[PDB]
Ligand binder design. Sequence first.
Ligand SMILES: Nc1ccc2cc3ccc(N)cc3nc2c1
Lengths: 26, 249, 10
Amino acid sequence: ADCGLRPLFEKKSLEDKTERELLESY
Amino acid sequence: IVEGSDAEIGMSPWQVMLFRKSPQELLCGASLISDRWVLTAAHCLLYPPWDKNFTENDLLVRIGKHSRTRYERNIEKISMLEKIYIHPRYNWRENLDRDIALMKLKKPVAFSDYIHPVCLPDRETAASLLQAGYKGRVTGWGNLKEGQPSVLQVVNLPIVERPVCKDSTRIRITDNMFCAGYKPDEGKRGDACEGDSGGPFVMKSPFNNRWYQMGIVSWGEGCDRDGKYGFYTHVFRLKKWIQKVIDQF
Amino acid sequence: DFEEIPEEYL
Ligand SMILES: Nc1ccc2cc3ccc(N)cc3nc2c1
């Protein structure tokens, strides 16, 4: 239900160092 | 992980370490899918050709880790296993088809900044995201070359077209596998390696911004060898089995 | 090579 939303990233609206690489490949 | 980088703290809160009790050693990676369940590769536990047949009492699950070797005192949580379930049709004789296993924890772990479950894909998420060229992310404490990292490593890799996967190996590829990695010409490198098996291949949905586990690190021929690819268990194709066992008890 | 873990886990 709360799955896949990281406390230190998604929950605080912070992005990790390389996640944009993934989103840009879609 | 070969050609990856150090993971950020809390970057992969579902990452689980499969740890042998005696002797103390890293066996494989795994992932947290609920407060009580861990998903990994069946070959991490059962592989007769090498006399590998681990039972619940042989193992510990360590969750919330970052450092490979350090006991992260008020950060990681170590759990005992209650029951291990291996896919009844896991094919260790031939090609590691249906390389998947579920482990039920003795008791629920509490979530924290460092411990949080990953989502399992539904039909449409799998359909939208499992496409050649789309990149997923692999994490683990496995070897850096075909030596060992001090901290969790991460690498992002593109899913590869089925034809090129099947044409890179003599092994028979099934619908329950997909392969990923860069082609020789693409310039970029990266692959899982020994110690990374059982770990998660995850993708972030652009629709709801959640991380979903699309694959499990299953097998490869060497590590980061040109013209070769990593093979992953297709999590969605085996979700019926996953739901069945978590429903049973 | 791994740091010793608390004995209540073994
Ligand atoms: N993509 C991958 C996935 C799993 C792997 C497991 C391995 C086990 C032993 C070894 N010598 C090399 C391995 N390489 C792998 C490469």
